[PDB]
Design a binder for these strands. Structure first.
Length: 63
DNA sequence: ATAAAATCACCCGCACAGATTTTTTAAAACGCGCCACGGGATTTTTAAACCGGTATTTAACGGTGTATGAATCCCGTTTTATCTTCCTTTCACTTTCTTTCTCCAGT
């Protein structure tokens, strides 16, 4: 849906683009997270979705 | 360049039918041993053949009235003879990669 010049000047020009470089911090945690999210089991994924999304959003700090 | 008509891959949960894969179990087998059973040589007893005779019990024979066996006509069942096929295989050809041989401009 974008014109080529817009795409160039917004994403592909090395002088005016911003990107992210992917790095790995801890190997143990990453494997567990990948297994939980992309694995065949359903219950751990549902529990993880419920904990982070349904909860942990009603922040009771107000500061 | 305008019209007419078509086709396929993946993501997300859940329930179930079907296809491997271990795991357990009952049957078959092997080695060793002993005593239950059958062979051989005497005693004993009884099953059946044999004479009677008598008293029944069966089968062959002569009428009636059916039930069935061989023949005919079909249609689903299984065999056998008869076509096409995909993987194995090499193999001559082609292509593509690697090393070598010069040219050759520059100093």
């Amino acid at each position: 849906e974008m014109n080529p010049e817009q795409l160039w000047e917004t994403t592909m020009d090395p002088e005016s683009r911003r990107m992210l470089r992917v790095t790995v911090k801890d190997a143990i945690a990453a494997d567990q997270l990948f297994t939980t999210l992309m694995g065949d089991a359903v219950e751990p994924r549902r529990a993880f979705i419920e904990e982070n999304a349904l909860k942990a959003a009603n922040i009771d700090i107000e500061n």
